[PDB]
Amino acid sequence: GNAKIGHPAPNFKATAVMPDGQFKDISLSDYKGKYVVFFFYPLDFTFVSPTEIIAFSDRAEEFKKLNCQVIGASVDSHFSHLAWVNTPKKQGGLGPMNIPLVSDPKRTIAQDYGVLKADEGISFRGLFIIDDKGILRQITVNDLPVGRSVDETLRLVQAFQFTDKHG
Amino acid sequence: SGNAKIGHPAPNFKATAVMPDGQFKDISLSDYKGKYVVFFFYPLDFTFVSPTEIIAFSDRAEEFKKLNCQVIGASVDSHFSHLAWVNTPKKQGGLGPMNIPLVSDPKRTIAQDYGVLKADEGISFRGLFIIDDKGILRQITVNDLPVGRSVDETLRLVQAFQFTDKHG
Numbered sequence: 001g002n003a004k005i006g007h008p009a010p011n012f013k014a015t016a017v018m019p020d021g022q023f024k025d026i027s028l029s030d031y032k033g034k035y036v037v038f039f040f041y042p043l044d045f046t047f048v049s050p051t052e053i054i055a056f057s058d059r060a061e062e063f064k065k066l067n068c069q070v071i072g073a074s075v076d077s078h079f080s081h082l083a084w085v086n087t088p089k090k091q092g093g094l095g096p097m098n099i100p101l102v103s104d105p106k107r108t109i110a111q112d113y114g115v116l117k118a119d120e121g122i123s124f125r126g127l128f129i130i131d132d133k134g135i136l137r138q139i140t141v142n143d144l145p146v147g148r149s150v151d152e153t154l155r156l157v158q159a160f161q162f163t164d165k166h167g
Numbered sequence: 168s169g170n171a172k173i174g175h176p177a178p179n180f181k182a183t184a185v186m187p188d189g190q191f192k193d194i195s196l197s198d199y200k201g202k203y204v205v206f207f208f209y210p211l212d213f214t215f216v217s218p219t220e221i222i223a224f225s226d227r228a229e230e231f232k233k234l235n236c237q238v239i240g241a242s243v244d245s246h247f248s249h250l251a252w253v254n255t256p257k258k259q260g261g262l263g264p265m266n267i268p269l270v271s272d273p274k275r276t277i278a279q280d281y282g283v284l285k286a287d288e289g290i291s292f293r294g295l296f297i298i299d300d301k302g303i304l305r306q307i308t309v310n311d312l313p314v315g316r317s318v319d320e321t322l323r324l325v326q327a328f329q330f331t332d333k334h335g
């Protein structure tokens with residue numbers, strides 16, 4: 001992996017399912033000027049991952065007030081993401097999303113971020129906080145069974161923005 | 168940058184630590200096989216973000232004990248510097264008495280093994296690692312220098328890994 005604290009976060013260009021439900025090719029560099037929370041989850045149509053994704057989506061406004069873009073990603077195809085979004089939450093899907101979901105079918109983004117579980121071809125639960133300069137500020141990687149906290153992620157984003165202010 | 172990989176044995180180390188009783192002891196990560204371990208790096212002694220974290224982990228050590236989890240802190244400073252900070256009154260910015268050991272990594276090889284050395288400065292980033300009772304690395308956390316870690320979040324992770332170890 002090439003993700004190093006204090007260095008530019010590895011860029012990517014990938015197809016995402018955008019909040020409007022439609023495909024768009026996006027790049028991490030598209031969000032320079034904003035903080036970014038970039039998180040991986042292992043795969044679509046699973047048990048723990050939708051709880052995390054929906055939590056980040058539901059609370060997207062709290063990141064927007066921090067000028068912070070949230071982006072999720074898995075090695076699934078962009079069609080698989082679309083299927084999951086188009087499946088209602090009450091039927092085990094994601095439902096409508098407030099955040100883009102990146103597809104990493106070549107596994108190169110997960111590799112660049114050091115979160116590929118090589119023996120399965122899927123990502124660990126990696127989460128990365130990138131500042132408005134594109135510099136990586138925080139690395140979080142959970143083994144597959146344990147999910148992430150939106151509260152903790154907001155705490156971190158808020159703290160980096162506060163400490164960015166001292167000069 | 169490091170040999171710390173999720174699902175692999177956490178890199179072993181043997182290093183001098185200042186123990187809670189205020190004495191120096193050479194300890195190894197492998198000493199704690201059979202228990203979960205929270206192993207965290209902080210950049211330097213006699214600083215001003217690090218003490219909030221260290222004191223919080225020490226103050227709340229009993230919550231980790233109830234999870235059968237050992238907490239270990241570490242920085243590149245000498246163990247003598249660690250003890251000097253422990254022995255500095257809290258009212259003057261010291262750590263005060265500690266409930267957790269503080270490892271000294273003067274060769275920077277432990278930080279390098281865990282992939283958290285800030286190479287242009289010779290100090291560790293704020294790396295935190297959750298290691299299960301079999302020695303396997305389960306969680307990686309690395310913060311840039313200015314931003315501290317949360318004991319609440321660390322407890323949540325340790326307990327959650329332990330729960331999923333028993334039933335998934």
Ligand SMILES: O=C(CCc1ccc(O)c2c1[C@H](C(=O)O[C@H](Cc1ccc(O)c(O)c1)C(=O)O)[C@@H](c1ccc(O)c(O)c1)O2)O[C@H](Cc1ccc(O)c(O)c1)C(=O)O
Nearest residue numbers: 163166167209210211212214215216217218290312313314
């Ligand atoms: O002791 C600290 C930082 C203490 C501090 C003091 C006064 C502040 O005013 C302040 C902070 C916090 C901070 O991180 O400042 C640093 C350094 C700095 C301070 C003032 C400046 O003007 C400047 O330019 C640069 C930064 O931002 O780089 C942040 C803060 C954070 C939480 C709060 O609750 C709060 O109130 C304020 O503001 O850290 C070291 C680590 C370490 C090792 C080597 C480095 O070389 C190094 O940089 C850092 C550790 O703890 O081991």
